Amino acid sequence: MHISSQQHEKAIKSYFDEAQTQGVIIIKEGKNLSTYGNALARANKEYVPASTFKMLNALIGLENHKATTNEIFKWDGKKRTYPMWEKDMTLGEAMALSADPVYQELARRTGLELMQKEVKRVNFGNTNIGTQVDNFWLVGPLKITPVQEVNFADDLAHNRLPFKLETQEEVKKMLLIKEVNGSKIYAKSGWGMGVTPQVGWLTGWVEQANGKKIPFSLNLEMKEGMSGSIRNEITYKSLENLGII
Ligand SMILES: *C(=O)[C@@H]([C@@H]1NC(C(=O)O)=C(S[C@@H]2CN[C@H](CNS(N)(=O)=O)C2)[C@@H]1C)[C@@H](C)O
């Protein structure tokens, strides 16, 4: 195809520039990683995974029978940070709404010891969860790089993680966020508001009509009065610019 890589690089940098943030999107094609955006050096820097960890929390919870995909986690009736969270949901609904109370309950069912062992076993990020089973993904000590995140998405997309195949398919079904003319986008968003500066994530893959999977991971700095939806907007623009969707 005819567009220069100079032009692709410049167009993708501009999407980050126009959102007035600093960020990177890593794309993996087969075994080859490509890094785009306006702060390339973020690629191998460690950030908290924030809600991207829901993906692994779900794998672990499901593998270890801490929940089923149809179980309804009841709202306890206490005020939640966001009103969309004050309702009863499955893991899948909770994943789409990035509902931390559901995933905090799941983590507590799993428990500190099984959680530390499982995160070590899958080798996620720096693999350190500390001593608090319900908050290690927001504010430390667990960290991961944008490169390690596309490599996780690539593992999940191909069923290579060390979990039952059915566990992995179950979670993957939870992650479908967009269909764009025959392509399907599976991804999990992330927003660490605790840490300073804030981190935004969108990690996932595109499944093309012909079955090919192209993993990506977007990582940027969120600032106050950014809508969470630039994460998606920058991502879809980047994938469209590259002819992936
Ligand atoms: C985890 O990162 C964090 C969740 N995650 C998100 C998120 O959007 O990734 C939120 S923001 C909350 C849920 N989505 C609503 C906004 N929609 S959008 N399209 O982003 O504008 C509000 C929340 C901080 C957990 C750990 O708190």
Side-chain angles (χ1 to χ4, degrees), residues 56-78 80-102:
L56 179 54
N57 195 344
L59 293 156
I60 291 167
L62 284 174
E63 183 83 348
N64 292 285
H65 305 102
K66 304 310 177 171
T68 61
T69 53
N70 47 74
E71 181 174 358
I72 293 162
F73 289 70
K74 261 71 172 271
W75 177 43
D76 65 355
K78 306 199 189 299
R80 299 269 126 104
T81 312
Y82 308 95
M84 51 160 66
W85 296 350
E86 290 168 357
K87 63 151 151 157
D88 307 325
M89 56 200 113
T90 61
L91 285 183
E93 292 153 358
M95 184 83 74
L97 300 179
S98 210
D100 209 50
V102 176

Short mmCIF file of all heavy atoms in Angstrom, two decimals, residues 56-102, unseen atoms left out:
data_model
loop_
_atom_site.label_atom_id
_atom_site.label_comp_id
_atom_site.label_asym_id
_atom_site.label_seq_id
_atom_site.Cartn_x
_atom_site.Cartn_y
_atom_site.Cartn_z
N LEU A 56 -7.15 -10.02 33.86
CA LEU A 56 -6.48 -11.15 34.50
C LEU A 56 -7.25 -11.59 35.78
O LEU A 56 -7.26 -12.77 36.13
CB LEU A 56 -5.03 -10.79 34.84
CG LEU A 56 -4.13 -11.81 35.52
CD1 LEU A 56 -4.09 -13.13 34.77
CD2 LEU A 56 -2.74 -11.21 35.63
N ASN A 57 -7.86 -10.63 36.46
CA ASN A 57 -8.68 -10.89 37.61
C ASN A 57 -9.83 -11.87 37.21
O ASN A 57 -10.03 -12.90 37.86
CB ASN A 57 -9.21 -9.55 38.11
CG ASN A 57 -9.78 -9.62 39.50
OD1 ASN A 57 -10.08 -10.70 40.01
ND2 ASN A 57 -9.97 -8.46 40.12
N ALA A 58 -10.53 -11.57 36.10
CA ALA A 58 -11.53 -12.49 35.56
C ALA A 58 -10.97 -13.87 35.20
O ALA A 58 -11.61 -14.88 35.55
CB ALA A 58 -12.30 -11.88 34.37
N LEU A 59 -9.82 -13.94 34.51
CA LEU A 59 -9.24 -15.28 34.17
C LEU A 59 -9.03 -16.12 35.44
O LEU A 59 -9.45 -17.26 35.53
CB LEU A 59 -7.93 -15.19 33.38
CG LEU A 59 -8.07 -14.60 31.98
CD1 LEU A 59 -6.72 -14.02 31.57
CD2 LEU A 59 -8.65 -15.62 30.94
N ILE A 60 -8.41 -15.51 36.43
CA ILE A 60 -8.05 -16.17 37.66
C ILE A 60 -9.30 -16.58 38.46
O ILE A 60 -9.35 -17.68 38.99
CB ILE A 60 -7.19 -15.22 38.53
CG1 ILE A 60 -5.81 -15.00 37.89
CG2 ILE A 60 -7.04 -15.77 39.92
CD1 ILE A 60 -4.99 -13.82 38.52
N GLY A 61 -10.29 -15.68 38.56
CA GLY A 61 -11.50 -15.94 39.28
C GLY A 61 -12.24 -17.08 38.64
O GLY A 61 -12.69 -17.98 39.34
N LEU A 62 -12.31 -17.09 37.32
CA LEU A 62 -13.04 -18.10 36.62
C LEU A 62 -12.33 -19.46 36.67
O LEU A 62 -12.96 -20.50 36.98
CB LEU A 62 -13.29 -17.69 35.18
CG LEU A 62 -14.40 -16.65 35.04
CD1 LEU A 62 -14.49 -16.19 33.63
CD2 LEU A 62 -15.75 -17.22 35.49
N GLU A 63 -11.04 -19.46 36.36
CA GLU A 63 -10.24 -20.70 36.41
C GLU A 63 -10.40 -21.41 37.77
O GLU A 63 -10.58 -22.62 37.84
CB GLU A 63 -8.76 -20.36 36.21
CG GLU A 63 -7.83 -21.59 36.17
CD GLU A 63 -7.76 -22.26 34.78
OE1 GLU A 63 -8.58 -21.95 33.86
OE2 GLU A 63 -6.84 -23.09 34.62
N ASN A 64 -10.35 -20.62 38.83
CA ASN A 64 -10.34 -21.13 40.19
C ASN A 64 -11.75 -21.26 40.82
O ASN A 64 -11.88 -21.44 42.00
CB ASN A 64 -9.36 -20.28 41.01
CG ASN A 64 -7.90 -20.48 40.55
OD1 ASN A 64 -7.30 -21.51 40.84
ND2 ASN A 64 -7.36 -19.54 39.78
N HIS A 65 -12.79 -21.21 39.97
CA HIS A 65 -14.19 -21.34 40.44
C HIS A 65 -14.58 -20.36 41.55
O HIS A 65 -15.28 -20.73 42.49
CB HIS A 65 -14.46 -22.79 40.86
CG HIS A 65 -14.14 -23.78 39.78
ND1 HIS A 65 -12.98 -24.54 39.77
CD2 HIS A 65 -14.80 -24.09 38.63
CE1 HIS A 65 -12.96 -25.28 38.68
NE2 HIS A 65 -14.05 -25.03 37.97
N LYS A 66 -14.12 -19.12 41.46
CA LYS A 66 -14.59 -18.11 42.38
C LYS A 66 -15.84 -17.45 41.86
O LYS A 66 -16.43 -16.66 42.58
CB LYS A 66 -13.50 -17.06 42.66
CG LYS A 66 -12.19 -17.67 43.20
CD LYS A 66 -12.47 -18.63 44.37
CE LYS A 66 -11.20 -19.27 44.85
NZ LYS A 66 -11.44 -20.01 46.11
N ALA A 67 -16.26 -17.76 40.64
CA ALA A 67 -17.45 -17.16 40.04
C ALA A 67 -17.78 -17.94 38.77
O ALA A 67 -16.95 -18.70 38.29
CB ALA A 67 -17.19 -15.66 39.67
N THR A 68 -18.99 -17.76 38.24
CA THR A 68 -19.32 -18.30 36.94
C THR A 68 -19.63 -17.13 36.06
O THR A 68 -19.72 -16.01 36.56
CB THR A 68 -20.56 -19.21 37.01
OG1 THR A 68 -21.68 -18.43 37.46
CG2 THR A 68 -20.34 -20.36 37.97
N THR A 69 -19.82 -17.34 34.77
CA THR A 69 -20.06 -16.20 33.91
C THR A 69 -21.50 -15.67 34.03
O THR A 69 -21.81 -14.64 33.45
CB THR A 69 -19.76 -16.50 32.43
OG1 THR A 69 -20.46 -17.68 32.06
CG2 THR A 69 -18.25 -16.75 32.23
N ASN A 70 -22.35 -16.33 34.80
CA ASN A 70 -23.78 -15.97 34.87
C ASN A 70 -24.17 -15.49 36.27
O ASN A 70 -25.23 -14.88 36.47
CB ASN A 70 -24.64 -17.15 34.39
CG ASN A 70 -24.20 -18.48 35.04
OD1 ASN A 70 -24.47 -18.70 36.20
ND2 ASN A 70 -23.49 -19.34 34.29
N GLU A 71 -23.26 -15.72 37.21
CA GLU A 71 -23.43 -15.26 38.59
C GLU A 71 -23.71 -13.76 38.63
O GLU A 71 -23.07 -13.00 37.95
CB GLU A 71 -22.20 -15.59 39.45
CG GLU A 71 -22.35 -15.15 40.91
CD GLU A 71 -21.21 -15.59 41.83
OE1 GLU A 71 -20.30 -16.28 41.37
OE2 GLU A 71 -21.24 -15.22 43.02
N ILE A 72 -24.68 -13.34 39.43
CA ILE A 72 -25.00 -11.93 39.51
C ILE A 72 -24.41 -11.42 40.80
O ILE A 72 -24.74 -11.92 41.88
CB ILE A 72 -26.49 -11.72 39.37
CG1 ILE A 72 -26.90 -12.09 37.96
CG2 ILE A 72 -26.88 -10.26 39.65
CD1 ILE A 72 -28.43 -12.34 37.82
N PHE A 73 -23.46 -10.49 40.69
CA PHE A 73 -22.88 -9.85 41.86
C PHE A 73 -23.83 -8.71 42.24
O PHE A 73 -24.01 -7.72 41.47
CB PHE A 73 -21.48 -9.32 41.54
CG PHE A 73 -20.45 -10.39 41.35
CD1 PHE A 73 -20.49 -11.22 40.23
CD2 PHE A 73 -19.42 -10.55 42.29
CE1 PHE A 73 -19.56 -12.23 40.06
CE2 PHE A 73 -18.47 -11.56 42.12
CZ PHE A 73 -18.55 -12.40 40.98
N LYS A 74 -24.49 -8.86 43.39
CA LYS A 74 -25.46 -7.87 43.84
C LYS A 74 -24.80 -6.61 44.37
O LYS A 74 -23.86 -6.67 45.15
CB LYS A 74 -26.38 -8.44 44.95
CG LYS A 74 -27.78 -8.92 44.44
CD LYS A 74 -27.72 -10.16 43.61
CE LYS A 74 -29.13 -10.73 43.30
NZ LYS A 74 -29.62 -11.69 44.37
N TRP A 75 -25.33 -5.47 43.94
CA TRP A 75 -25.03 -4.21 44.54
C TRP A 75 -25.41 -4.28 46.02
O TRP A 75 -26.57 -4.60 46.34
CB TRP A 75 -25.83 -3.09 43.86
CG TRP A 75 -25.62 -1.74 44.49
CD1 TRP A 75 -24.43 -1.20 44.88
CD2 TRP A 75 -26.62 -0.74 44.74
NE1 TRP A 75 -24.63 0.06 45.40
CE2 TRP A 75 -25.95 0.38 45.29
CE3 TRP A 75 -28.01 -0.69 44.57
CZ2 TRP A 75 -26.64 1.52 45.71
CZ3 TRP A 75 -28.69 0.45 44.97
CH2 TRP A 75 -28.01 1.54 45.53
N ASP A 76 -24.46 -3.91 46.89
CA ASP A 76 -24.70 -3.93 48.32
C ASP A 76 -25.56 -2.74 48.82
O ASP A 76 -25.88 -2.67 50.02
CB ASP A 76 -23.39 -4.04 49.14
CG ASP A 76 -22.48 -2.80 48.99
OD1 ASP A 76 -22.79 -1.90 48.18
OD2 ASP A 76 -21.42 -2.73 49.69
N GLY A 77 -25.86 -1.80 47.93
CA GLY A 77 -26.69 -0.66 48.31
C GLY A 77 -25.93 0.53 48.89
O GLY A 77 -26.56 1.51 49.28
N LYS A 78 -24.60 0.43 48.97
CA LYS A 78 -23.80 1.58 49.36
C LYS A 78 -23.50 2.48 48.16
O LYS A 78 -23.34 1.99 47.06
CB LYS A 78 -22.49 1.12 50.06
CG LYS A 78 -22.74 0.17 51.24
CD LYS A 78 -21.57 0.04 52.22
CE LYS A 78 -21.83 -1.12 53.27
NZ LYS A 78 -23.07 -1.00 54.20
N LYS A 79 -23.42 3.78 48.37
CA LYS A 79 -23.13 4.71 47.28
C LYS A 79 -21.82 4.32 46.61
O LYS A 79 -20.84 4.00 47.29
CB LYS A 79 -23.04 6.16 47.79
N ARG A 80 -21.81 4.36 45.29
CA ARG A 80 -20.59 4.02 44.55
C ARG A 80 -20.06 5.28 43.89
O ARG A 80 -20.79 6.24 43.73
CB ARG A 80 -20.88 2.90 43.53
CG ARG A 80 -21.35 1.61 44.18
CD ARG A 80 -20.20 0.68 44.50
NE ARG A 80 -20.15 0.26 45.91
CZ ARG A 80 -20.53 -0.94 46.36
NH1 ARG A 80 -21.03 -1.86 45.52
NH2 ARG A 80 -20.42 -1.22 47.65
N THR A 81 -18.78 5.31 43.55
CA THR A 81 -18.20 6.50 42.93
C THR A 81 -18.99 6.96 41.70
O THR A 81 -19.17 8.16 41.50
CB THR A 81 -16.78 6.25 42.49
OG1 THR A 81 -16.05 5.64 43.57
CG2 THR A 81 -16.13 7.56 42.03
N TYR A 82 -19.46 6.02 40.88
CA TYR A 82 -20.23 6.32 39.68
C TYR A 82 -21.59 5.66 39.80
O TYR A 82 -21.69 4.51 40.25
CB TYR A 82 -19.50 5.83 38.41
CG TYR A 82 -18.07 6.31 38.32
CD1 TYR A 82 -17.02 5.52 38.79
CD2 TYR A 82 -17.77 7.59 37.82
CE1 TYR A 82 -15.67 5.98 38.73
CE2 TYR A 82 -16.43 8.07 37.75
CZ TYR A 82 -15.40 7.26 38.21
OH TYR A 82 -14.10 7.73 38.18
N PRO A 83 -22.66 6.38 39.44
CA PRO A 83 -23.99 5.78 39.61
C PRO A 83 -24.27 4.59 38.71
O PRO A 83 -25.08 3.72 39.07
CB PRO A 83 -24.94 6.94 39.29
CG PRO A 83 -24.18 8.12 39.77
CD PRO A 83 -22.74 7.85 39.35
N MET A 84 -23.61 4.53 37.57
CA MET A 84 -23.76 3.33 36.72
C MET A 84 -23.37 2.02 37.48
O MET A 84 -23.79 0.93 37.08
CB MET A 84 -22.96 3.47 35.41
CG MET A 84 -21.46 3.88 35.60
SD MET A 84 -20.26 3.54 34.24
CE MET A 84 -20.84 4.63 32.91
N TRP A 85 -22.59 2.14 38.57
CA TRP A 85 -22.16 0.98 39.34
C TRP A 85 -23.15 0.49 40.42
O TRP A 85 -22.94 -0.55 41.03
CB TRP A 85 -20.82 1.23 39.99
CG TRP A 85 -19.68 1.42 39.00
CD1 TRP A 85 -19.70 1.22 37.66
CD2 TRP A 85 -18.33 1.79 39.33
NE1 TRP A 85 -18.46 1.46 37.13
CE2 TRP A 85 -17.61 1.82 38.14
CE3 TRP A 85 -17.68 2.11 40.54
CZ2 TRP A 85 -16.27 2.17 38.10
CZ3 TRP A 85 -16.34 2.44 40.50
CH2 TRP A 85 -15.64 2.46 39.29
N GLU A 86 -24.20 1.25 40.65
CA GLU A 86 -25.15 0.93 41.72
C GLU A 86 -26.23 -0.01 41.23
O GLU A 86 -27.42 0.29 41.29
CB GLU A 86 -25.74 2.24 42.31
CG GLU A 86 -24.67 2.97 43.07
CD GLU A 86 -25.02 4.40 43.46
OE1 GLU A 86 -26.11 4.89 43.09
OE2 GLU A 86 -24.16 5.03 44.12
N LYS A 87 -25.81 -1.15 40.73
CA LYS A 87 -26.73 -2.13 40.24
C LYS A 87 -26.03 -3.46 40.24
O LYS A 87 -24.80 -3.52 40.43
CB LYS A 87 -27.13 -1.81 38.81
CG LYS A 87 -25.98 -1.86 37.82
CD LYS A 87 -26.54 -2.24 36.49
CE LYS A 87 -25.77 -1.69 35.33
NZ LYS A 87 -26.12 -2.60 34.20
N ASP A 88 -26.82 -4.50 40.01
CA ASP A 88 -26.40 -5.89 40.01
C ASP A 88 -25.89 -6.28 38.65
O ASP A 88 -26.48 -5.94 37.63
CB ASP A 88 -27.59 -6.79 40.34
CG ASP A 88 -28.30 -6.37 41.65
OD1 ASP A 88 -27.63 -5.90 42.62
OD2 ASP A 88 -29.51 -6.51 41.73
N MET A 89 -24.78 -7.01 38.64
CA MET A 89 -24.15 -7.36 37.40
C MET A 89 -23.35 -8.66 37.42
O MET A 89 -22.89 -9.13 38.50
CB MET A 89 -23.31 -6.19 36.81
CG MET A 89 -22.27 -5.62 37.67
SD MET A 89 -21.81 -3.94 37.10
CE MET A 89 -22.36 -2.86 38.40
N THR A 90 -23.21 -9.22 36.22
CA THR A 90 -22.30 -10.32 35.97
C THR A 90 -20.89 -9.76 35.78
O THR A 90 -20.73 -8.55 35.63
CB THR A 90 -22.65 -11.04 34.69
OG1 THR A 90 -22.55 -10.14 33.59
CG2 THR A 90 -24.09 -11.66 34.75
N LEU A 91 -19.89 -10.66 35.72
CA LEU A 91 -18.51 -10.29 35.48
C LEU A 91 -18.39 -9.54 34.18
O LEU A 91 -17.63 -8.57 34.10
CB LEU A 91 -17.61 -11.52 35.43
CG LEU A 91 -17.32 -12.15 36.79
CD1 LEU A 91 -16.37 -13.30 36.66
CD2 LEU A 91 -16.77 -11.13 37.76
N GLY A 92 -19.12 -10.03 33.16
CA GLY A 92 -19.14 -9.44 31.82
C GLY A 92 -19.70 -8.04 31.81
O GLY A 92 -19.09 -7.12 31.24
N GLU A 93 -20.85 -7.84 32.46
CA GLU A 93 -21.37 -6.47 32.57
C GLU A 93 -20.42 -5.59 33.37
O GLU A 93 -20.20 -4.42 33.04
CB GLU A 93 -22.76 -6.48 33.21
CG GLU A 93 -23.80 -7.13 32.29
CD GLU A 93 -24.99 -7.76 33.04
OE1 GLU A 93 -25.02 -7.75 34.31
OE2 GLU A 93 -25.89 -8.27 32.33
N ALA A 94 -19.84 -6.14 34.43
CA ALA A 94 -18.92 -5.41 35.24
C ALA A 94 -17.64 -5.00 34.48
O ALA A 94 -17.09 -3.96 34.74
CB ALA A 94 -18.58 -6.19 36.49
N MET A 95 -17.18 -5.86 33.57
CA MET A 95 -16.05 -5.62 32.70
C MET A 95 -16.31 -4.45 31.75
O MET A 95 -15.45 -3.56 31.61
CB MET A 95 -15.76 -6.89 31.88
CG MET A 95 -14.53 -6.79 31.00
SD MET A 95 -13.06 -7.14 31.99
CE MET A 95 -13.18 -8.93 32.18
N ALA A 96 -17.49 -4.43 31.12
CA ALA A 96 -17.88 -3.32 30.22
C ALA A 96 -18.00 -2.00 30.95
O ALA A 96 -17.71 -0.93 30.37
CB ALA A 96 -19.25 -3.63 29.50
N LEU A 97 -18.48 -2.04 32.20
CA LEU A 97 -18.65 -0.80 32.97
C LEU A 97 -17.40 -0.52 33.81
O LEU A 97 -17.38 0.44 34.58
CB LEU A 97 -19.88 -0.85 33.89
CG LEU A 97 -21.28 -1.07 33.31
CD1 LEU A 97 -22.33 -1.10 34.42
CD2 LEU A 97 -21.70 0.00 32.29
N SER A 98 -16.39 -1.38 33.69
CA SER A 98 -15.20 -1.25 34.53
C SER A 98 -15.57 -1.02 36.01
O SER A 98 -15.04 -0.13 36.69
CB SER A 98 -14.27 -0.16 33.96
OG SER A 98 -12.91 -0.45 34.27
N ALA A 99 -16.48 -1.85 36.52
CA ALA A 99 -17.02 -1.73 37.88
C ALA A 99 -16.09 -2.32 38.94
O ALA A 99 -16.09 -3.52 39.16
CB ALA A 99 -18.37 -2.38 37.97
N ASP A 100 -15.35 -1.46 39.63
CA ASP A 100 -14.29 -1.93 40.53
C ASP A 100 -14.84 -2.77 41.75
O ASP A 100 -14.15 -3.70 42.21
CB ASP A 100 -13.38 -0.75 41.00
CG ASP A 100 -11.90 -1.21 41.33
OD1 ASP A 100 -11.23 -1.93 40.51
OD2 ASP A 100 -11.40 -0.82 42.42
N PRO A 101 -16.05 -2.46 42.25
CA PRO A 101 -16.58 -3.22 43.40
C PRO A 101 -16.79 -4.69 43.09
O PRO A 101 -16.48 -5.54 43.90
CB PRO A 101 -17.95 -2.56 43.70
CG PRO A 101 -17.82 -1.13 43.06
CD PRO A 101 -16.83 -1.23 41.95
N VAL A 102 -17.25 -4.98 41.89
CA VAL A 102 -17.36 -6.39 41.48
C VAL A 102 -16.01 -7.10 41.44
O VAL A 102 -15.84 -8.20 41.99
CB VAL A 102 -18.06 -6.50 40.18
CG1 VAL A 102 -18.08 -7.95 39.71
CG2 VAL A 102 -19.51 -5.96 40.40
#
